[PDB]
Design a binder for this molecule. Structure first.
Ligand SMILES: Nc1nc2c(ncn2[C@@H]2O[C@H](COP(=O)(O)OP(=O)(O)NP(=O)(O)O)[C@@H](O)[C@H]2O)c(=O)[nH]1
Ligand SMILES: [Mg+2]
Lengths: 291, 179
């Protein structure tokens, strides 16, 4: 049947799950088809894109700005659900030449984060949206865009997107930091990713005024007593960034970078952890290290 | 003119949604874990002297079915948003995933917050596992506060294994759907 293998494509299923669905009685497919027809999406991509443009418009007095953004978090959550659960075509439209959804999203994230990152008016305005969950939800939106192959590619090729994702590492919510690290790790693992990541962390250093790159990454990682998931994500990312490179001499330079920031001494204590999730990341790193 | 009620169950993978549905309708607890894609069951129920058909819809918890799951949503009368009381992570996903997701697709539809697997809340082996990962089980109080903040109709808990609280979960869902 063929009005099914088209509904199948709209769902962005991994090959193993698509195969499983395919071995379905021709009757069930029909029910699925009926289910799609019954299904209508809430809004088109430009609905959300326009709202985000409204929040960014500096020609607006403070009044309308404060009133416009009073629902910003709600709108972002609806965009995220739309990106994550609508038919994949909804995402293509969002990302397309008419819409330029990825640009506005990256732009809003940058704005939401401008305050945290260190015109006085926009610095005031930013502080308004920087204590809400907006940043975190933008990162979630990027995550949904990235689960779509074509969308992942646009994130890579984008001038600012991974730069801004890296900047979110400064967000004080450890749950947010974890997600950022997971995104950063995924990019780093594909061909061409490592350079984009290093460039992002060079950019981070300059804007944030670090002494050495990865400085604040290490700070947060050392400073965190309580959130195992963030620690798992930190260790994992560190292990990918030093040990996935092609050039062995580059691998050792990267290794020593983290050594000079006290990772080795920190892992000395940390390896005695009780958490088996964290245990495996630390082990993987120790196994990869050179003498 | 037989009256209908559609109830949809959501929450993280391995939270217990299928067991609770099966233990309630069927009175047996299924021992083998088989991850759901989509399923539905139907039951007849009497409230205030009137019979209703209670449609029950099981969903996939895992993210890979994220674009498949919303096909289960239209015409929903009440949602059960489930998390395991011994899985803080599943509790967190309530706020970040499940409530945003049903409110987006089905505005103005009531939901209950459902804590599952309460039998495990006192199991030392379970307490021990959470402990190694700097975690503890969710207390009724904590869950009740979240239910308030997210505007759930109410908070309820159960064990599909012991059937404790199980009936009352569905009692509450029915009432929530007819209010
Ligand atoms: N102790 C205890 N274990 C339970 C209970 N309910 C479910 N489980 C166990 O939890 C595991 C998964 O339950 P299941 O209902 O399959 O989860 P699910 O929520 O449908 N996951 P999915 O989204 O993949 O379908 C199984 O091991 C089941 O045995 C309970 O009330 N008590
Ligand atoms: Mg199941």
């Amino acid at each position: 049947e063929e009005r099914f293998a088209i509904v199948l494509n709209a769902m962005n299923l991994p090959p193993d799950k698509a195969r499983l669905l395919r071995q379905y009685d021709n009757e069930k497919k029909w029910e699925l088809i009926c289910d799609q027809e019954r299904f209508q999406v809430k809004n088109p991509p430009h609905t959300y894109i326009q709202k985000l443009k409204g929040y960014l418009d500096p020609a607006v007095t403070r009044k309308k700005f404060r009133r416009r953004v009073q629902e910003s978090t709600q709108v972002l959550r609806e965009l995220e659900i739309s990106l994550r659960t609508n038919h994949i075509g909804w995402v293509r439209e969002f990302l397309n030449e008419e819409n330029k959804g990825l640009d506005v999203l990256v732009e809003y994230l940058s704005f939401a984060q401008y305050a945290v990152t260190f015109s006085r008016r926009t610095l005031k305005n930013s502080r308004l949206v920087s204590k809400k969950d907006d940043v975190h939800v933008c990162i979630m939106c990027l995550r949904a865009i990235m689960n779509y192959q074509y969308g992942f590619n646009m994130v890579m090729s984008h001038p600012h997107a991974v730069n801004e994702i890296a900047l979110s590492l400064n967000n004080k919510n450890p749950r947010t930091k974890a997600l950022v690290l997971e995104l950063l790790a995924a990019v780093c693992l594909v061909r061409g990713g490592h350079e984009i990541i290093l460039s992002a962390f060079d950019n981070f250093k300059e804007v944030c005024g670090e002494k050495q790159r990865f400085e604040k990454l290490m700070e947060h990682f050392r400073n965190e007593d309580n959130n195992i998931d963030f620690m798992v994500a930190s260790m994992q990312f560190i292990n990918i960034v030093v040990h996935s490179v092609e050039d062995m001499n580059f691998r050792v330079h990267l290794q020593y970078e983290f050594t000079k920031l006290g990772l080795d001494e920190y892992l000395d204590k940390l390896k005695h952890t009780e958490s088996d999730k964290l245990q495996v990341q630390i082990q993987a790193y120790l196994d990869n290290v050179f003498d | 003119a037989m009256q209908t009620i559609k109830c949809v169950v959501v929450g993280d993978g391995a939270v217990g949604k299928t067991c609770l549905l099966i233990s309630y309708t069927t009175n047996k607890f299924p021992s083998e874990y088989v991850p759901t894609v989509f399923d539905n069951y139907a039951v007849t129920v009497m409230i205030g002297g009137e019979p209703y058909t209670l449609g029950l819809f099981d969903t996939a918890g895992q993210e890979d079915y994220d674009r498949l799951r919303p096909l289960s949503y239209p015409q929903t009368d009440v949602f059960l948003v489930c998390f395991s009381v011994v899985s803080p992570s599943s509790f967190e996903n309530v706020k970040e995933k499940w409530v945003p997701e049903i409110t987006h697709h089905c505005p103005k539809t009531p939901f209950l917050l459902v804590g599952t697997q309460i039998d495990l809340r006192d199991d030392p082996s379970t307490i021990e596992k959470l402990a190694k990962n700097k975690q503890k089980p969710i207390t009724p109080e904590t869950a009740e506060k979240l239910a308030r903040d997210l505007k759930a109709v109410k908070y309820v808990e159960c064990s599909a294994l012991t059937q404790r609280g199980l009936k009352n979960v569905f009692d509450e869902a029915i009432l929530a759907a007819l209010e």
